[PDB]
Amino acid sequence: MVLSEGEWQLVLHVWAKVEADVAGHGQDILIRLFKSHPETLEKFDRFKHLKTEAEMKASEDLKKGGVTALTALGAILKKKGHHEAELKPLAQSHATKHKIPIKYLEFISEAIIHVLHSRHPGNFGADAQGAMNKALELFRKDIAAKYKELGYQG
């Protein structure tokens, strides 16, 4: 499932807007994830104490975690599919230490799409959302294959 250059440019043009304020986008995305799928919060200990959206917005550690995850994702997207080196350590840490199933990567992909659709209607019309979906599907397919190589069914 190879993206075209035109699809990559749609992905990168909306990501350029995320990069005006990665911290604020990360807060919105993690909060959307945790509200839509509370098991992703309650099962991981780093944030399991956060009870409300107000607590989530006030959490400096949640903000930092969102910046870390979105910056890693941006580096993957900028490789335009040539992301084998970037996926290796990420797959290992997410398949061995604290196991993050593919289902949860699907949930955060939905949260990314939801927040980009809300914040960026000027760069996230239907074609751009389809391109981002393709990019996130490729990411998940390749990390799922690495999970299996590493001994984790995902």
Residue numbers in the entry: 0 to 153
Give me lines lifted from the publication on this model.
In particular, heme-containing proteins and enzymes such as cytochrome P450s, myoglobin, and cytochrome c proteins, have provided promising metalloprotein scaffolds for catalyzing a growing number of carbene transfer reactions, including cyclopropanation, Y-H carbene insertion (Y = N, S, B, Si), C–H insertion, and others, with high activity and stereocontrol. Here, we applied a combination of complementary spectroscopic, crystallographic, and computational tools to investigate and elucidate the mechanism and catalytic steps of a recently reported myoglobin-catalyzed cyclopropanation reaction with diazoketones. An optimal biocatalyst for this reaction was established to be myoglobin (Mb) variant Mb(H64G,V68A), which delivers the (1S,2S) cyclopropanation product 3 with excellent stereoselectivity (>99% de and ee) and up to ~1000 catalytic turnovers (TON).
